[PDB]
Specification:
Elements (H helix, E strand, L loop, with lengths): L6 E8 L12 E5 L7 H10 L4 E4 L5 H15 L4 E4 L16 H16 L5 E6 L13 H16 L4 E7 L5 H12 L6 E5 L2 E9 L16 E5 L4 H13 L3 E6 L8 H10 L3 E6 L5 H9 L7 E6 L15 H22 L6 E7 H4 L6 H19 L5 E5 L1 E2 L8 H10 L1 E4 L1 H14 L3 E4 L1 E2 L1 H8 L12 H6 L2
Parallel strand pairs: 2-3, 2-4, 4-5, 5-6, 6-7, 9-10, 9-12, 10-11, 12-13, 13-14, 14-17, 15-16
Antiparallel strand pairs: 1-8, 1-17, 7-8, 16-18
Helix pairs in contact: 1-5, 2-3, 3-4, 4-11, 9-11
């Protein structure tokens, strides 16, 4: 129950139908002009009406947009809300190959709105960026990344953040009226999915307790690939896999066998009877991943991937983050997980496990780029399930003992927010509960809700935490 207590999941609950009147003040719609053709972008522009002012966000030029926005705000006076359709730009930015153009443009729009003093709440619309409601299909993991950024905008700029709304693929008049009614007043909700059945909103809940055996997890066997396998959590994952039956562990990281601690890790694993391969290669390098897969023993086919590669450093507040910082944070997450997905789809793996973060699940100030990068992982795991493929996303809280949060700097701030350091064995024992259940998505975190809830909600309420009774109690 100690391990059950670490597991949470995202659910979607029905909320009230909104009012029937459109907003009284003027809306400002923001369009990516090369990527304004999708049906849902037309349906949304039509629902906003012809009195809505339209801003075409061209390229990625913060100072140019700040100037253009300042002119609009001068001419129009205050807007009621800003409605961004930038998410429809899913093509990669030409200069930053791991950043979807719409993600870069949404960052620069949040930045330029603050620069210009346009204060109306920003709403970021997606289509297929969340899996909400029974049978729902997350069709665009790229747009799913924009939710990780948006939750961090709502932490950093709470007064000028509206929220996120996912649209259905057909935006009929019932969907349009939910939309415009939420923009009038959203009832204090800010992470919303419009579906045929109603409006759903995002919630964090404790996961159901483990059912010993219920997931038909197959025995660990053959070759298992742990990207980031020489790093802190990846090394501990590899040890556990060795103890459990893996014939062969393939560990990767940019430094490979030159990684800190690598020789000792190899010796620890080989003592347990496992074949060990340690390779040096960037998880975003598709050709190197293909070569690595082509090399596998005939008698030890790839049976599972654990994607632990990642960096969190050189992030910045939303107001300051650059596209080159965002690219570097996205590389081992979006680019590398897309390669892993595409080169293993046909292999019938037993597990495809992606390591996300609480930064992506609930949001962490100061970590927009890392939140977006991890949110892509969570969305890709739901998207793969829709294709009939296994996938799981595990959004860790804080690890103790090994890995990126052992820096007293990085450790001190997390623990002080109530995201407490987990013992490796407990974190791994909870991941094994998730994998035995074959759950698609979970956060695995030790929380002190009496510290977390009041800090997280100091400037704006969080409907997300209303389904965690300890958070409700802390706020009473
Ligand atoms: N520790 C924690 O509390 C949390 C961790 N996470 C996630 O867990 C995973 C592991 O974190 P952790 O073990 O703590 O961190 P570490 O820094 O210990 O390990 C991360 C590893 O990824 C490798 N790596 C980084 N970039 C690339 C890349 N482009 N290609 C291949 N390898 C790369 C690093 O090696 P190299 O530099 O040699 O490439 C290293 O092996 C990360 O994805 C992280 O985001 C999430 C929440 C909390």
């Amino acid at each position: 129950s100690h391990m059950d207590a670490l597991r949470y999941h995202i659910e979607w609950n029905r909320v009230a139908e909104p009012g029937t009147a459109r907003p009284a003040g003027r809306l400002l719609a923001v369009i990516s002009p090369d990527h304004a053709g999708a049906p849902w972008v037309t349906a949304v522009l039509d629902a906003l009406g012809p009195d809505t002012v339209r801003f075409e966000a061209k390229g990625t030029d913060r100072a140019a947009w700040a100037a253009q926005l300042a002119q609009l705000r001068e001419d129009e006076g205050e807007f009621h809300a800003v409605v961004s359709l930038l998410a429809a730009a899913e093509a990669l930015h030409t200069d930053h190959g791991s950043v979807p153009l719409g993600l870069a443009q949404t960052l620069l729009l949040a930045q330029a709105l603050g620069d210009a003093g346009l204060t109306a709440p920003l709403w970021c619309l997606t289509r297929g960026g969340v899996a909400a409601g029974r049978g729902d299909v997350l069709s665009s993991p790229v747009q799913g990344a924009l939710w990780g950024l948006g939750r961090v905008i709502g932490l950093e700029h709470p007064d000028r953040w509206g929220g996120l709304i996912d649209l259905p693929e057909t935006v009929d008049t019932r969907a349009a009226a939910r939309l415009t009614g939420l923009l009038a007043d959203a009832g204090g909700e800010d992470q919303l999915a419009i579906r045929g059945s109603g409006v759903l909103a995002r919630r964090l809940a404790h996961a159901a307790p483990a059912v010993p055996g219920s997931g038909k997890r197959p025995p660990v066997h053959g070759s298992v690939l742990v990207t980031g396998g020489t790093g802190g959590i990846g090394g501990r994952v590899a040890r556990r896999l060795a103890e459990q039956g893996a014939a062969h562990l393939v560990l990767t990281s940019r430094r490979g066998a030159d990684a800190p601690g690598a020789a000792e890790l190899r010796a620890e694993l080989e003592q347990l009877g496992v074949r060990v391969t340690i390779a040096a290669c960037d998880a975003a390098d598709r050709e190197a991943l293909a070569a690595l897969l082509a090399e596998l023993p005939e008698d030890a086919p790839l049976t599972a991937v654990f994607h632990s590669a990642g960096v969190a450093h050189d992030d910045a507040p939303v107001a300051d983050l650059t596209l080159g910082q965002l690219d570097a944070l996205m590389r081992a997450k979006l680019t590398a997980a897309r390669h892993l997905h595409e080169l293993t789809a046909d292999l019938d793996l037993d597990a495809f496990v992606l390591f996300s973060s609480g930064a992506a699940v609930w949001g962490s100030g100061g970590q927009p780029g890392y939140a977006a990068a991890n949110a892509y992982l969570d969305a890709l795991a739901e998207h793969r399930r829709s294709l009939g493929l296994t996938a799981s996303s595990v959004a860790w809280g804080t690890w103790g003992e090994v890995g990126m949060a052992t820096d007293p700097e990085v450790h001190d701030r997390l623990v002080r927010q109530g995201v407490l350091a987990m013992e490796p064995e407990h974190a791994l024992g909870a991941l094994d509960q998730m994998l035995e259940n074959d759950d698609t998505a979970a956060a695995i975190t030790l929380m002190d809700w009496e510290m977390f809830a009041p800090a997280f909600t100091a400037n704006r309420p969080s409907a997300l935490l209303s389904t965690v009774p300890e958070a409700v109690s802390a706020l009473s």
